[PDB]
Design a protein around this ligand. Sequence first.
Ligand SMILES: N#Cc1ccccc1C(=O)Oc1c(Br)cc(Br)cc1CNC(=O)c1ccccc1[N+](=O)[O-]
Ligand SMILES: N#Cc1ccccc1C(=O)Oc1c(Br)cc(Br)cc1CNC(=O)c1ccccc1[N+](=O)[O-]
Lengths: 162, 164
Amino acid sequence: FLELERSSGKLEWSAILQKMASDLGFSKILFGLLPKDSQDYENAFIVGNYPAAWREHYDRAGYARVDPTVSHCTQSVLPIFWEPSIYQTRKQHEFFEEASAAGLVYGLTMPLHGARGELGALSLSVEAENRAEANRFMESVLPTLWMLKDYALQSGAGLAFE
Amino acid sequence: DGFLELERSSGKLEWSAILQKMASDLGFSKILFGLLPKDSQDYENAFIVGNYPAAWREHYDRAGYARVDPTVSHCTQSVLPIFWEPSIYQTRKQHEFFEEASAAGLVYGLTMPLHGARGELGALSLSVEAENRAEANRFMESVLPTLWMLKDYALQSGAGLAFE
Ligand SMILES: N#Cc1ccccc1C(=O)Oc1c(Br)cc(Br)cc1CNC(=O)c1ccccc1[N+](=O)[O-]
Ligand SMILES: N#Cc1ccccc1C(=O)Oc1c(Br)cc(Br)cc1CNC(=O)c1ccccc1[N+](=O)[O-]
C-alpha cells in the first residue's frame, strides 16, 4: 500500500491505483474526491479507467443526483454493493441500465471521508458471469479493499490538496 | 454478518458490550471509542465508550495528556492507523504519559482515526497485552484487515447511537 505515497504525479498514482485494483481482480475503477462543503461532482478530482464516454454521459445526464451510491456516501462510511436492491426508484433503474451499457454492472462503492472533510468515493467493478460469482469474488478481497480505500483516500487527498 | 449486531444494539451499555467482545476476540482486551460531533473541539463532553480503567481516563483528562498523546494530532490529519510509539526525545510529560499508560496496562496498541460521514471526529484505540514490541506488532498486524472493517462499522453505528 505504501507505493501510493511514493508515486510522482497523478498519472503514476493512477497507474499504481489501477494496477492494485487490477491485480486484486477489478478491471474498472473510479476514484473521486471533492473538498469539504462541495457537491459539484462534475468537477471532482477523478482518477481511474471508466470508459470516457460513460464519464461524460454521467455528468451530462445529471446522474450524480440519481446514483444511489452518491446519496449513500453522504450518509455512510460503509461500502454499498451494486445489487438490484439499491436501484429503488424508476430513475435509478434507468441509471443501472446505462451503467450496464458501459460494462459496469457488478461491483461496489466505498465512501471516502477525509480527515479534512474531503468527500469521495472509490468505486470498483468486476467482470463476472453472474451476481453470485461477482459477490463471492468481492467477499474474498473485501478486507484488502477496505484497507485500500483508506490508503487511497489519504494519499489521494495528499495529491489533490497538498 | 457479525458486525450487524452493532446496529441491532439498543443503548450505550449494549453497544459497548458488543464492541468490547468483538475487540477482545481479536486480542484487544482494552479499548476506548471516542467521538465528537461536527465542529466540536472539547474532548471532555465527547461520546466515550469502552473498558479503559476509569482511573486512567480520569487522569488522562486531569493531566492534560491530549496535547502530549501523539495519536490526537495524528487523528486530525489522517485516516490511517497509528501504532503507539514514544518519541524518545521526550518531555517529562510525554514520558509520564507513556509511563502512566504502561502502569495502567496500556503499553502496546494502536489508534484508528474516525472521520464520520457527517463530520464526526473520533478515535478507536485498542491495546494488546504483549511482552515486547515484536510480539505486539505481530498481534496487531495479524488482525489489521478485520480491525479496519470493525472501526468503520463502529464509527457508523456509534455515530448513530451518539448523535442521531
Ligand atoms: N467525487 C466524488 C464522489 C463523492 C461521493 C460519492 C461519489 C463520488 C463520485 O465520484 O461519483 C461518481 C462520479 Br463524480 C462519476 C461517475 Br461516472 C461515477 C460516480 C460514482 N458511481 C459509480 O461509480 C457507480 C455506482 C454504481 C453503479 C454504477 C456506477 N458507475 O458505473 O458509475
Ligand atoms: N474522542 C476522541 C478522540 C478524537 C481524536 C483523537 C483521540 C480521541 C480520544 O478518544 O483520545 C483519548 C482520550 Br479522549 C482518552 C484516553 Br484515556 C485516550 C485517548 C486516546 N489515546 C490512547 O488511547 C493512547 C494512545 C497512545 C498511548 C496510550 C494511550 N492510552 O493508554 O490512552
